[PDB]
Amino acid sequence: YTAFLGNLPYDVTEESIKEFFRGLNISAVRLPREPSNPERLKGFGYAEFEDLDSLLSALSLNEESLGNRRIRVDVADQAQD
Template sequence: MKSIYVGNIPFSVTENDIRDLFGAHGRVVSVKLVEDRETGRFRGFGFVEMDDADALAAIEALDGKDMGGRTLKVNEARPREPRPRR
């Protein structure tokens, strides 16, 4: 299972839109669009989980693709780096 980072997503997009877009390249296990903790507004990026081979095909096909006038940034998600507490 691979986690894919998807950035520069138009703010009008829904989880179903992303599921449909990535579903054209294989089975989508999950979609998570990230929201701001304080405002609850979508932050313009998210994560998609897919099987390994499907994920690689989706990354190859969708990185740089135009969606709603914005160029998607699609790559394999990196583990979250620890941040110092405030």
């Protein structure tokens, strides 16, 4: 499945979601942020997730109000859906 978020207050994606996102492993994480060195905080990410475990957290974990930015998490298709 694919989980994309509204806006990340600092915990965005890529390693962060892979671990913070939830209980299950996510196949991939695409965040407009570059952690290779920059370490940016924006709002808009996508991850391939089992959702299952993620779905539970993704439903609540997400949309949290952080400072002035909330990251929404929703399940978006999977391979071919």
